[PDB]
């Protein structure tokens, strides 16, 4: 249970390809995004800097909270 803001993330498109990018890391992973908040709630056994690089390479830089 890590949770990233991610400023790019701005409408239902970017959302849609920051949740593909972490299921296609961990098809165990669940993912919950908020267009209104563009906060990104993940629940898996990698590490939040292992998320956080995918999300980057991708075009999705964010910030952990
Ligand atoms: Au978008
Ligand atoms: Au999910």
């Given at each position: ?47 939040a800097e292992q998320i956080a690089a995918a999300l980057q390479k991708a075009g999705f ?5």
């Amino acid at each position: 249970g890590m949770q990233f803001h991610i400023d790019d993330m701005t409408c239902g498109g970017c959302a849609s390809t920051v949740k593909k990018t972490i299921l296609t890391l961990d098809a165990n992973a669940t993912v919950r995004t908020d267009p209104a908040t563009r906060l990104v709630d993940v629940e898996t056994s990698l590490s939040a800097e292992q998320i956080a690089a995918a999300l980057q390479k991708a075009g999705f830089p964010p910030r952990e909270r």
